[PDB]
Amino acid sequence: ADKELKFLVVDDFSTMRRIVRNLLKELGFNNVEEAEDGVDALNKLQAGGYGFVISDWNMPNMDGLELLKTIRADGAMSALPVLMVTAEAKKENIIAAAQAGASGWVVKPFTAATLEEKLNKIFEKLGM
Numbered sequence: 594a595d596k597e598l599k600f601l602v603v604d605d606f607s608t609m610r611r612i613v614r615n616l617l618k619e620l621g622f623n624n625v626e627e628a629e630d631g632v633d634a635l636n637k638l639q640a641g642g643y644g645f646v647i648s649d650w651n652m653p654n655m656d657g658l659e660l661l662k663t664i665r666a667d668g669a670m671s672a673l674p675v676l677m678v679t680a681e682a683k684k685e686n687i688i689a690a691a692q693a694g695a696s697g698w699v700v701k702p703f704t705a706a707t708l709e710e711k712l713n714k715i716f717e718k719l720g721m
């Protein structure tokens with residue numbers, strides 16, 4: 594629950610990224626970087642320093658699930674929480690992501706209260 598925890602907000606809609614970034618700031622988390630797709634995020638995650646990944650399920654080039662599976666397979670970031678963002682809960686998606694290792698799901702649009710409950714729950718299931 595460290596306020597300086599560095600977030601990576603991955604989403605191909607720049608407006609969605611700003612929303613998430615403002616929601617985060619609002620909660621007290623100001624260390625936020627953005628990525629527009631799976632590849633982009635990996636390029637940034639490489640540099641290190643990251644602590645939390647907020648990712649959109651649906652992205653061109655490298656989607657949310659393929660990004661999560663790549664992180665999880667990465668020796669070094671294999672343990673980064675990944676909160677999946679979707680516009681519609683679907684059981685098969687939730688199940689796919691579950692097995693690939695997603696830290697949770699948030700259905701957009703969402704409020705800061707919702708984003709906070711999500712984070713809190715993740716921070717907790719992680720003994721974090």
Ligand SMILES: [Ca+2]
Nearest residue numbers: 605649651652
């Ligand atoms: Ca998207």
